[PDB]
C-alpha cells in the first residue's frame, strides 16, 4: 500500500509532466503555426494604409508650411 | 460769336456730365477696392489645391 501509493503518485507525476509539455508544445504550435505571417499580412495592408495616408498627409504639411 | 457762346455752354454740359461720372466711379472704385479686400482669402487656399494638382501628375 505505501510503496503501492509511492509508485502509483510517481508515475502520475511523470504522466502530468509530459500532459504538461504537450499542452506547452500545444502553445507553441499556435504560435508557430500562422501567428506571424498573419500579422506579416497584417502589416502588409497597414503599409498600404500608410501609403494611403501618403497623399492627404501633404495638405496637412502644406496648411502648417502656408 | 453765338456759336462761340454756344460752344461755351455746351462743354461747361460736358463738364458737368464729366464730373457726374467721375463720382459715380470713385464710389463704384471704392466697392471694387472692398471686394477684392474681402476676396483675398485665396492664396494659400489656391496654393493648397494647387500642390493637390501638382501631386496628380508626381506618382
Redesign the interface.
Known amino acids: 500500500t505505501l510503496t503501492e501509493e509511492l509508485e502509483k503518485l510517481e508515475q502520475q507525476i511523470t504522466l502530468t509532466l509530459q500532459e504538461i509539455d504537450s499542452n506547452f508544445a500545444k502553445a507553441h504550435r499556435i504560435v508557430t503555426t500562422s501567428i506571424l505571417p498573419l500579422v506579416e499580412q497584417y502589416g502588409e495592408h497597414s503599409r498600404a494604409v500608410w501609403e494611403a495616408t501618403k497623399?492627404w498627409k501633404?495638405?496637412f504639411e502644406?496648411?502648417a508650411n502656408? | 460769336s453765338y456759336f462761340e457762346q454756344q460752344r461755351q455752354a455746351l462743354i461747361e454740359e460736358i463738364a458737368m456730365n464729366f464730373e457726374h461720372v467721375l463720382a459715380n466711379i470713385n464710389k463704384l472704385n471704392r466697392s471694387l477696392e472692398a471686394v477684392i479686400a474681402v476676396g483675398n482669402e485665396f492664396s494659400?487656399v489656391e496654393?493648397?489645391w494647387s500642390?493637390?494638382e501638382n501631386?496628380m501628375s508626381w506618382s
Open positions: 497623399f501633404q495638405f502644406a496648411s502656408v | 494659400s496654393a493648397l500642390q493637390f501631386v
